Protein backbone atom coordinates (compact mmCIF):
# COMPACT_ATOMS: atom_id res chain seq x y z
CA UNK A 1 0.00 0.00 0.00
CA UNK A 2 1.00 3.64 -0.57
CA UNK A 3 -0.32 7.17 -0.46
CA UNK A 4 0.09 10.43 -2.44
CA UNK A 5 0.06 14.08 -1.41
CA UNK A 6 -1.02 16.63 -2.27
CA UNK A 7 -4.01 15.37 -4.29
CA UNK A 8 -4.07 18.42 -6.49
CA UNK A 9 -1.53 21.11 -7.38
CA UNK A 10 -1.57 24.49 -9.07
CA UNK A 11 1.53 25.15 -11.20
CA UNK A 12 2.37 28.69 -12.16
CA UNK A 13 5.19 30.78 -13.58
CA UNK A 14 7.25 27.80 -14.62
CA UNK A 15 7.88 26.94 -10.96
CA UNK A 16 8.26 23.23 -10.31
CA UNK A 17 6.08 21.47 -7.71
CA UNK A 18 6.16 18.05 -6.05
CA UNK A 19 3.53 15.35 -5.65
CA UNK A 20 5.01 12.94 -3.14
CA UNK A 21 4.71 9.19 -2.64
CA UNK A 22 4.61 7.75 0.87
CA UNK A 23 5.23 4.09 1.57
CA UNK A 24 2.50 2.53 3.70
CA UNK A 25 3.61 -1.10 3.68
CA UNK A 26 6.29 -3.45 4.97
CA UNK A 27 7.24 -4.49 1.46
CA UNK A 28 9.11 -2.57 -1.14
CA UNK A 29 6.91 -1.30 -3.96
CA UNK A 30 7.32 -0.33 -7.63
CA UNK A 31 5.19 2.62 -8.75
CA UNK A 32 4.57 3.76 -12.31
CA UNK A 33 3.56 7.31 -13.13
CA UNK A 34 1.82 8.37 -16.34
CA UNK A 35 -0.11 11.46 -17.34
CA UNK A 36 -3.27 12.34 -19.20
CA UNK A 37 -4.44 15.74 -20.32
CA UNK A 38 -8.12 16.43 -19.73
CA UNK A 39 -10.04 17.65 -22.77
CA UNK A 40 -13.25 19.59 -22.23
CA UNK A 41 -12.89 19.60 -18.48
CA UNK A 42 -15.94 20.00 -16.30
CA UNK A 43 -18.36 19.35 -19.10
CA UNK A 44 -20.45 16.70 -20.76
CA UNK A 45 -17.89 15.89 -23.42
CA UNK A 46 -14.91 15.55 -21.04
CA UNK A 47 -12.31 12.94 -21.91
CA UNK A 48 -8.64 12.14 -21.24
CA UNK A 49 -5.73 11.73 -23.59
CA UNK A 50 -2.45 9.94 -22.95
CA UNK A 51 0.60 12.15 -23.06
CA UNK A 52 4.28 11.21 -22.66
CA UNK A 53 5.81 12.40 -19.36
CA UNK A 54 8.83 14.08 -21.01
CA UNK A 55 7.60 15.71 -24.22
CA UNK A 56 4.27 17.34 -23.42
CA UNK A 57 3.31 20.72 -22.00
CA UNK A 58 3.70 19.18 -18.54
CA UNK A 59 6.98 17.49 -17.51
CA UNK A 60 6.54 14.70 -14.95
CA UNK A 61 9.60 12.93 -13.60
CA UNK A 62 10.62 10.25 -12.74
CA UNK A 63 8.10 7.90 -14.38
CA UNK A 64 9.11 4.90 -12.26
CA UNK A 65 9.73 4.86 -8.52
CA UNK A 66 11.26 2.15 -6.36
CA UNK A 67 9.53 2.59 -3.00
CA UNK A 68 11.41 0.94 -0.04
CA UNK A 69 9.60 0.15 3.22
CA UNK A 70 8.66 3.32 5.11
CA UNK A 71 10.24 5.65 2.52
CA UNK A 72 8.93 8.80 0.86
CA UNK A 73 9.67 9.80 -2.74
CA UNK A 74 8.82 12.63 -5.02
CA UNK A 75 7.52 13.20 -8.48
CA UNK A 76 8.41 16.60 -9.91
CA UNK A 77 5.94 18.63 -12.01
CA UNK A 78 7.07 21.46 -14.34
CA UNK A 79 5.14 23.44 -16.95
CA UNK A 80 7.19 23.29 -20.16
CA UNK A 81 5.38 26.20 -21.77
CA UNK A 82 3.04 28.45 -19.80
CA UNK A 83 -0.46 28.31 -21.31
CA UNK A 84 -2.54 31.38 -22.21
CA UNK A 85 -5.49 29.69 -20.52
CA UNK A 86 -5.63 27.08 -17.72
CA UNK A 87 -5.12 23.47 -18.77
CA UNK A 88 -5.69 20.42 -16.58
CA UNK A 89 -4.00 17.08 -16.38
CA UNK A 90 -4.37 14.04 -14.23
CA UNK A 91 -1.17 12.38 -13.08
CA UNK A 92 -1.73 8.69 -12.21
CA UNK A 93 0.28 6.62 -9.75
CA UNK A 94 0.06 2.84 -10.03
CA UNK A 95 1.94 0.09 -8.20
CA UNK A 96 3.16 -2.68 -10.50
CA UNK A 97 5.35 -5.77 -10.44
CA UNK A 98 9.15 -5.20 -10.63
CA UNK A 99 10.41 -5.07 -14.23
CA UNK A 100 13.68 -6.90 -13.81
CA UNK A 101 -2.42 -16.76 -5.80
CA UNK A 102 -5.61 -17.94 -4.09
CA UNK A 103 -4.66 -17.20 -0.52
CA UNK A 104 -4.03 -13.45 -0.61
CA UNK A 105 -6.10 -10.55 -1.95
CA UNK A 106 -5.52 -8.91 -5.30
CA UNK A 107 -5.98 -5.15 -5.00
CA UNK A 108 -4.83 -2.47 -7.44
CA UNK A 109 -5.28 1.04 -6.10
CA UNK A 110 -4.50 3.78 -8.60
CA UNK A 111 -4.33 7.36 -7.33
CA UNK A 112 -4.64 10.47 -9.45
CA UNK A 113 -3.58 14.02 -8.76
CA UNK A 114 -5.48 16.75 -10.60
CA UNK A 115 -2.89 19.21 -11.91
CA UNK A 116 -3.80 22.74 -13.02
CA UNK A 117 -1.39 24.43 -15.44
CA UNK A 118 -2.16 28.11 -14.83
CA UNK A 119 -1.55 31.24 -16.96
CA UNK A 120 0.84 33.87 -15.51
CA UNK A 121 -1.55 36.80 -15.16
CA UNK A 122 -4.80 35.38 -14.01
CA UNK A 123 -8.11 36.85 -15.16
CA UNK A 124 -11.46 35.67 -13.89
CA UNK A 125 -14.21 36.92 -16.21
CA UNK A 126 -17.75 35.70 -16.87
CA UNK A 127 -20.38 36.40 -19.54
CA UNK A 128 -24.13 35.88 -19.48
CA UNK A 129 -26.45 34.60 -22.18
CA UNK A 130 -29.89 33.02 -22.70
CA UNK A 131 -31.09 29.78 -24.31
CA UNK A 132 -33.97 28.65 -26.47
CA UNK A 133 -35.59 29.21 -23.13
CA UNK A 134 -33.88 32.16 -21.66
CA UNK A 135 -32.58 29.59 -19.23
CA UNK A 136 -29.58 31.66 -18.36
CA UNK A 137 -26.12 30.44 -19.40
CA UNK A 138 -22.76 31.42 -17.90
CA UNK A 139 -19.72 31.58 -20.18
CA UNK A 140 -16.12 31.57 -18.99
CA UNK A 141 -14.39 34.40 -20.88
CA UNK A 142 -11.38 34.46 -18.57
CA UNK A 143 -8.14 32.44 -18.55
CA UNK A 144 -8.79 30.34 -15.45
CA UNK A 145 -11.57 28.14 -14.19
CA UNK A 146 -14.41 29.79 -12.32
CA UNK A 147 -15.58 27.94 -9.28
CA UNK A 148 -19.15 28.94 -8.82
CA UNK A 149 -20.57 28.17 -5.42
CA UNK A 150 -23.98 29.81 -5.57
CA UNK A 151 -25.79 32.19 -7.88
CA UNK A 152 -28.17 34.91 -6.71
CA UNK A 153 -30.83 35.73 -9.29
CA UNK A 154 -32.28 39.16 -8.52
CA UNK A 155 -35.14 41.23 -10.08
CA UNK A 156 -33.21 44.30 -9.20
CA UNK A 157 -29.60 45.39 -8.99
CA UNK A 158 -29.54 44.92 -5.22
CA UNK A 159 -28.62 41.70 -3.43
CA UNK A 160 -31.26 40.74 -0.90
CA UNK A 161 -33.77 38.21 0.37
CA UNK A 162 -36.03 38.59 -2.66
CA UNK A 163 -33.33 36.89 -4.86
CA UNK A 164 -33.46 33.09 -5.24
CA UNK A 165 -30.22 31.40 -4.21
CA UNK A 166 -29.28 28.20 -6.03
CA UNK A 167 -26.19 26.29 -4.91
CA UNK A 168 -24.01 25.17 -7.79
CA UNK A 169 -20.67 23.83 -6.76
CA UNK A 170 -19.44 23.64 -10.30
CA UNK A 171 -16.11 24.66 -11.81
CA UNK A 172 -16.47 26.29 -15.24
CA UNK A 173 -13.34 26.06 -17.34
CA UNK A 174 -12.15 28.70 -19.86
CA UNK A 175 -14.23 28.88 -23.07
CA UNK A 176 -16.85 26.57 -21.53
CA UNK A 177 -20.53 27.18 -20.67
CA UNK A 178 -22.77 26.37 -17.72
CA UNK A 179 -26.52 25.73 -17.90
CA UNK A 180 -28.00 27.28 -14.78
CA UNK A 181 -31.35 25.71 -15.56
CA UNK A 182 -33.18 28.97 -14.73
CA UNK A 183 -35.41 30.51 -17.40
CA UNK A 184 -37.32 32.94 -15.23
CA UNK A 185 -37.20 36.69 -15.83
CA UNK A 186 -34.56 38.11 -13.50
CA UNK A 187 -32.63 41.28 -14.27
CA UNK A 188 -29.28 40.76 -12.57
CA UNK A 189 -27.21 37.87 -11.37
CA UNK A 190 -24.61 37.63 -8.62
CA UNK A 191 -22.06 34.84 -9.03
CA UNK A 192 -20.49 33.49 -5.84
CA UNK A 193 -17.02 32.26 -6.62
CA UNK A 194 -14.98 29.69 -4.73
CA UNK A 195 -11.62 30.96 -3.59
CA UNK A 196 -8.45 29.62 -5.16
CA UNK A 197 -4.77 30.24 -4.42
CA UNK A 198 -4.93 33.42 -2.37
CA UNK A 199 -7.46 34.94 -4.72
CA UNK A 200 -10.29 36.47 -2.71
CA UNK A 201 -12.36 38.17 -5.42
CA UNK A 202 -15.78 37.53 -3.87
CA UNK A 203 -18.58 39.23 -5.85
CA UNK A 204 -19.50 39.35 -9.51
CA UNK A 205 -22.55 41.15 -10.76
CA UNK A 206 -23.55 40.64 -14.35
CA UNK A 207 -26.55 42.37 -15.93
CA UNK A 208 -28.90 39.90 -17.54
CA UNK A 209 -29.76 41.20 -20.97
CA UNK A 210 -33.46 41.57 -21.61
CA UNK A 211 -35.28 38.86 -23.52
CA UNK B 1 -15.86 2.60 -1.81
CA UNK B 2 -16.79 -1.10 -2.01
CA UNK B 3 -15.56 -4.56 -1.10
CA UNK B 4 -15.63 -8.08 -2.60
CA UNK B 5 -15.86 -11.53 -1.04
CA UNK B 6 -14.67 -14.17 -1.27
CA UNK B 7 -11.31 -13.18 -2.83
CA UNK B 8 -10.87 -16.53 -4.48
CA UNK B 9 -13.22 -19.37 -5.43
CA UNK B 10 -12.89 -22.96 -6.55
CA UNK B 11 -15.52 -23.99 -9.13
CA UNK B 12 -16.20 -27.64 -9.68
CA UNK B 13 -18.71 -29.97 -11.30
CA UNK B 14 -20.48 -27.21 -13.18
CA UNK B 15 -21.81 -25.81 -9.89
CA UNK B 16 -22.26 -22.05 -9.90
CA UNK B 17 -20.61 -19.88 -7.22
CA UNK B 18 -20.97 -16.25 -6.15
CA UNK B 19 -18.44 -13.48 -5.64
CA UNK B 20 -20.34 -10.75 -3.88
CA UNK B 21 -20.09 -6.96 -3.90
CA UNK B 22 -20.67 -5.00 -0.70
CA UNK B 23 -21.36 -1.29 -0.71
CA UNK B 24 -19.09 0.62 1.66
CA UNK B 25 -20.11 4.19 0.86
CA UNK B 26 -22.96 6.67 1.23
CA UNK B 27 -23.17 7.15 -2.52
CA UNK B 28 -24.53 4.82 -5.12
CA UNK B 29 -21.82 3.17 -7.22
CA UNK B 30 -21.51 1.65 -10.70
CA UNK B 31 -19.25 -1.40 -10.91
CA UNK B 32 -17.94 -3.06 -14.07
CA UNK B 33 -16.84 -6.68 -14.11
CA UNK B 34 -14.51 -8.19 -16.71
CA UNK B 35 -12.48 -11.36 -16.83
CA UNK B 36 -9.02 -12.46 -17.87
CA UNK B 37 -7.71 -15.98 -18.20
CA UNK B 38 -4.23 -16.51 -16.79
CA UNK B 39 -1.76 -18.15 -19.16
CA UNK B 40 1.26 -19.94 -17.71
CA UNK B 41 0.15 -19.38 -14.14
CA UNK B 42 2.70 -19.40 -11.36
CA UNK B 43 5.64 -19.15 -13.69
CA UNK B 44 8.06 -16.74 -15.29
CA UNK B 45 6.09 -16.39 -18.49
CA UNK B 46 2.71 -15.74 -16.83
CA UNK B 47 0.37 -13.33 -18.60
CA UNK B 48 -3.35 -12.50 -18.80
CA UNK B 49 -5.73 -12.49 -21.71
CA UNK B 50 -9.04 -10.68 -22.02
CA UNK B 51 -12.04 -12.93 -22.40
CA UNK B 52 -15.71 -12.00 -22.89
CA UNK B 53 -17.89 -12.69 -19.82
CA UNK B 54 -20.54 -14.65 -21.77
CA UNK B 55 -18.73 -16.73 -24.38
CA UNK B 56 -15.64 -18.16 -22.69
CA UNK B 57 -15.03 -21.28 -20.62
CA UNK B 58 -16.09 -19.23 -17.57
CA UNK B 59 -19.48 -17.46 -17.49
CA UNK B 60 -19.51 -14.30 -15.35
CA UNK B 61 -22.76 -12.39 -14.92
CA UNK B 62 -23.89 -9.63 -14.70
CA UNK B 63 -21.05 -7.52 -16.14
CA UNK B 64 -22.42 -4.25 -14.74
CA UNK B 65 -23.77 -3.65 -11.25
CA UNK B 66 -25.66 -0.66 -9.88
CA UNK B 67 -24.65 -0.56 -6.22
CA UNK B 68 -27.05 1.49 -3.98
CA UNK B 69 -25.91 2.79 -0.58
CA UNK B 70 -25.42 -0.04 1.91
CA UNK B 71 -26.49 -2.76 -0.55
CA UNK B 72 -24.92 -6.11 -1.42
CA UNK B 73 -24.95 -7.66 -4.90
CA UNK B 74 -23.70 -10.79 -6.51
CA UNK B 75 -21.74 -11.85 -9.51
CA UNK B 76 -22.38 -15.45 -10.55
CA UNK B 77 -19.58 -17.73 -11.78
CA UNK B 78 -20.26 -20.90 -13.84
CA UNK B 79 -17.88 -23.22 -15.68
CA UNK B 80 -19.25 -23.59 -19.22
CA UNK B 81 -17.20 -26.69 -19.97
CA UNK B 82 -15.33 -28.57 -17.25
CA UNK B 83 -11.60 -28.61 -18.03
CA UNK B 84 -9.43 -31.75 -18.03
CA UNK B 85 -6.85 -29.78 -16.06
CA UNK B 86 -7.23 -26.77 -13.72
CA UNK B 87 -7.46 -23.38 -15.38
CA UNK B 88 -7.30 -20.02 -13.62
CA UNK B 89 -8.94 -16.71 -14.27
CA UNK B 90 -8.96 -13.37 -12.58
CA UNK B 91 -12.29 -11.61 -12.35
CA UNK B 92 -11.86 -7.82 -11.96
CA UNK B 93 -14.29 -5.43 -10.29
CA UNK B 94 -13.97 -1.74 -11.10
CA UNK B 95 -16.13 1.23 -10.12
CA UNK B 96 -16.82 3.60 -13.01
CA UNK B 97 -18.93 6.63 -13.86
CA UNK B 98 -22.63 5.98 -14.71
CA UNK B 99 -23.15 5.28 -18.43
CA UNK B 100 -26.41 7.11 -18.95
CA UNK B 101 -12.08 18.32 -9.49
CA UNK B 102 -9.27 19.79 -7.38
CA UNK B 103 -10.93 19.59 -4.00
CA UNK B 104 -11.59 15.86 -3.64
CA UNK B 105 -9.34 12.82 -4.08
CA UNK B 106 -9.26 10.68 -7.19
CA UNK B 107 -8.93 7.02 -6.24
CA UNK B 108 -9.60 3.98 -8.42
CA UNK B 109 -9.49 0.72 -6.50
CA UNK B 110 -9.80 -2.38 -8.67
CA UNK B 111 -10.27 -5.72 -6.93
CA UNK B 112 -9.59 -9.11 -8.44
CA UNK B 113 -10.83 -12.53 -7.44
CA UNK B 114 -8.64 -15.48 -8.43
CA UNK B 115 -10.95 -18.15 -9.83
CA UNK B 116 -9.89 -21.79 -10.20
CA UNK B 117 -11.80 -23.87 -12.76
CA UNK B 118 -11.22 -27.40 -11.46
CA UNK B 119 -11.44 -30.83 -13.16
CA UNK B 120 -14.11 -33.24 -11.84
CA UNK B 121 -11.88 -36.05 -10.58
CA UNK B 122 -8.91 -34.43 -9.03
CA UNK B 123 -5.47 -36.00 -9.26
CA UNK B 124 -2.41 -34.59 -7.55
CA UNK B 125 0.72 -36.13 -9.05
CA UNK B 126 4.34 -34.98 -9.17
CA UNK B 127 7.44 -36.03 -11.12
CA UNK B 128 11.11 -35.45 -10.39
CA UNK B 129 13.94 -34.56 -12.75
CA UNK B 130 17.44 -33.03 -12.80
CA UNK B 131 18.98 -30.05 -14.62
CA UNK B 132 22.25 -29.22 -16.30
CA UNK B 133 23.17 -29.23 -12.66
CA UNK B 134 21.16 -31.96 -11.13
CA UNK B 135 19.44 -29.07 -9.43
CA UNK B 136 16.29 -31.02 -8.87
CA UNK B 137 13.13 -30.03 -10.75
CA UNK B 138 9.52 -30.82 -9.82
CA UNK B 139 6.99 -31.38 -12.60
CA UNK B 140 3.23 -31.24 -12.17
CA UNK B 141 1.87 -34.36 -13.92
CA UNK B 142 -1.55 -34.10 -12.27
CA UNK B 143 -4.69 -32.16 -13.21
CA UNK B 144 -4.64 -29.60 -10.40
CA UNK B 145 -2.14 -27.19 -8.95
CA UNK B 146 0.25 -28.49 -6.33
CA UNK B 147 0.82 -26.18 -3.44
CA UNK B 148 4.21 -27.04 -2.12
CA UNK B 149 4.94 -25.75 1.33
CA UNK B 150 8.29 -27.33 2.12
CA UNK B 151 10.49 -30.01 0.60
CA UNK B 152 12.54 -32.49 2.63
CA UNK B 153 15.65 -33.65 0.78
CA UNK B 154 16.86 -36.89 2.34
CA UNK B 155 19.94 -39.14 1.71
CA UNK B 156 17.83 -42.07 2.65
CA UNK B 157 14.23 -43.17 2.29
CA UNK B 158 13.43 -42.13 5.87
CA UNK B 159 12.22 -38.69 6.92
CA UNK B 160 14.32 -37.32 9.75
CA UNK B 161 16.57 -34.59 11.09
CA UNK B 162 19.37 -35.38 8.67
CA UNK B 163 17.20 -34.09 5.75
CA UNK B 164 17.46 -30.39 4.83
CA UNK B 165 14.11 -28.61 4.91
CA UNK B 166 13.60 -25.73 2.48
CA UNK B 167 10.37 -23.72 2.66
CA UNK B 168 8.83 -23.09 -0.74
CA UNK B 169 5.37 -21.66 -0.61
CA UNK B 170 4.88 -22.03 -4.30
CA UNK B 171 1.89 -23.32 -6.27
CA UNK B 172 2.91 -25.44 -9.27
CA UNK B 173 0.26 -25.59 -11.97
CA UNK B 174 -0.44 -28.59 -14.25
CA UNK B 175 2.24 -29.23 -16.91
CA UNK B 176 4.53 -26.67 -15.25
CA UNK B 177 7.95 -27.09 -13.59
CA UNK B 178 9.57 -25.80 -10.41
CA UNK B 179 13.30 -25.14 -9.94
CA UNK B 180 14.10 -26.18 -6.38
CA UNK B 181 17.56 -24.69 -6.71
CA UNK B 182 19.14 -27.76 -5.04
CA UNK B 183 21.83 -29.66 -6.95
CA UNK B 184 23.24 -31.69 -4.10
CA UNK B 185 23.17 -35.49 -4.13
CA UNK B 186 20.11 -36.58 -2.18
CA UNK B 187 18.32 -39.86 -2.83
CA UNK B 188 14.71 -39.14 -1.94
CA UNK B 189 12.48 -36.13 -1.63
CA UNK B 190 9.39 -35.52 0.48
CA UNK B 191 7.01 -32.87 -0.85
CA UNK B 192 4.86 -31.07 1.72
CA UNK B 193 1.63 -30.03 0.09
CA UNK B 194 -0.70 -27.23 1.12
CA UNK B 195 -4.24 -28.36 1.75
CA UNK B 196 -7.01 -27.32 -0.62
CA UNK B 197 -10.77 -27.88 -0.53
CA UNK B 198 -11.07 -30.72 1.96
CA UNK B 199 -8.15 -32.53 0.42
CA UNK B 200 -5.80 -33.70 3.17
CA UNK B 201 -3.26 -35.76 1.22
CA UNK B 202 -0.20 -34.84 3.30
CA UNK B 203 2.90 -36.77 2.21
CA UNK B 204 4.53 -37.43 -1.14
CA UNK B 205 7.74 -39.36 -1.46
CA UNK B 206 9.44 -39.38 -4.83
CA UNK B 207 12.67 -41.29 -5.48
CA UNK B 208 15.34 -39.05 -6.96
CA UNK B 209 16.85 -40.85 -9.91
CA UNK B 210 20.59 -41.25 -9.73
CA UNK B 211 22.79 -38.83 -11.63
Author numbering:
A (entry chain A), B (entry chain A): 1 to 100, 110 to 220
Paper text:
The full-length CfaA chaperone (residues 1–218) was expressed with a C-terminal hexahistidine tag and recovered from the periplasmic fraction post-cleavage of its 19-residue signal peptide. CfaA crystals diffracted X-rays well, revealing the symmetry of space group C2. The N- (1–129) and C-terminal (130–218) domains form two lobes angled at 121 degrees, as measured along the longest inertial vectors for the two domains, with a deep interlobe cleft. Each domain is represented by a seven-stranded β-barrel with a typical immunoglobulin (Ig) fold. Although there is one CfaA molecule present in a crystallographic asymmetric unit, application of the crystallographic two-fold symmetry generates a dimer that is self-capped by two adjoining G1 strands, presenting a continuous β-sheet between the two subunits. Importantly, the Class 5 chaperones also possess several structural features that are absent in both the FGL and FGS chaperones. They contain an insertion (D1′ insertion) that includes the D1′ β-strand and is rich in acidic residues (E45, E46, E48, D50 and D55), which form several pairs of salt bridges with contiguous basic residues (K36, R90 and R185). All Class 5 chaperones contain a long, very hydrophilic insertion in the C2–D2′ loop (K164 to N171, C2–D2′ insertion) that is stabilized by a unique disulfide bond (C163–C172). Structure superposition between PapD and CfaA suggested that the function of the N-terminal conserved arginine in FGL and FGS chaperones may be replaced by R154 in CfaA, which is only conserved in Class 5 chaperones and is stabilized by residue E86 via a salt bridge (∼2.7 Å). Given these multiple distinctions, we propose that the Class 5 chaperones be placed into a separate family distinct from the FGL or FGS chaperones.
